[PDB]
Structures are given as structure tokens and as C-alpha cells.
Amino acid sequence: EKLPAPTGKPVLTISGKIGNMNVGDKAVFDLAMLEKLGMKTIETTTPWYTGKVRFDGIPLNKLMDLVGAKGTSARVLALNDYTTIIPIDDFYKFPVIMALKMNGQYMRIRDKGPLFIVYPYDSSAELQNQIYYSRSAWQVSKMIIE
């Protein structure tokens, strides 16, 4: 089905090698649109917090299927200047999510919110390294499929 236009203010903008766009050559999502997609939880320890933290968000695998991603990598840009490149295969290899809530509460824009890419770190020794930590971009605003 076609992808609708955002009614609310945009929180995420996907562009690049995508097949489904709603605003020009881009897939723009308001918070409401993101929540229409199924949610998944990740309960894991992290190098940013003490103990386990509960992350609720949308799996990036279904997010890629929704925009019809046809690239190999994803250039993730933070609200300011942070940049990270994630191989799309990570989304199919791992149940990575785009977190919206942390401990059942929306993330504050001042902290990691509104969007935060999280991997299930404690689920695999392989995920316990800087590679995956560096790709866990917070305050996400744009995604470019390359």
C-alpha cells in the first residue's frame, strides 16, 4: 500500500535508495506514523546506563520493508552532527530496533530521545563491542539508504 503524508511534526526522515516515499524523494515519519508499526522490546545492559534497561521501539527490519530499502548500508545522522554507518544486513541479522521509549517512558529530546537505535547487546558476545555501540546512534533524525 502507498505511504501517507505526516500530519504531526517529522521525527524521522529516510531517503536515498528507497521505493516508498511520501514527501518528494523521501519517507518522512511523524511520531504517530512510527507507532502504527508493531513494537518490540529490548531488555539489555548498556555502556551508557547501569544495569538492564527496557527499550521499546520498531524493528528496523520492518522499517526497511516499509520504505522499500534497496541499499547495502544506512547513513544515520543525529539531530546535531553525530554520524554512523550501519550495514542494512545488521537489521536482518539482528533484531535491532528504533527505540521510542526507555523504561516505558518516551525519551526526552535532551537525553537520547526522540529516537535511539539499540541492539540486543547482552544477547550476544559479538554485539558487545564498540562497533555496535558506535552504530547505536541516539537523537536520530535522518537516515540515508546507500
Q: Site residues (CB under 6 A) for ligand NEU?
A: 78, 82, 133-134, 136-139
21 binds, among ligand NEU, Cl ion, none (CB under 5 to 8 A by kind): none
Residue with cell 544515520: 76
31 binds, among Cl ion, ligand NEU, none (CB under 5 to 8 A by kind): Cl ion
* Amino acid identity, position 16: G
In the bound complex, what is the minimum distance in angstroms from residue 18's beta carbon to ligand NEU?
Answer: 22
DSSP string, 8-27: S-EEEEEEES-S--SBTTEE
In the bound complex, what is the minimum distance in angstroms from residue 110's beta carbon to ligand NEU?
Answer: 12
110 binds, among ligand NEU, Cl ion, none (CB under 5 to 8 A by kind): none
State the burial class of residue 142 (Cβ atoms within 10 Å of its Cβ: 0-12, 13-18, 19+): middle
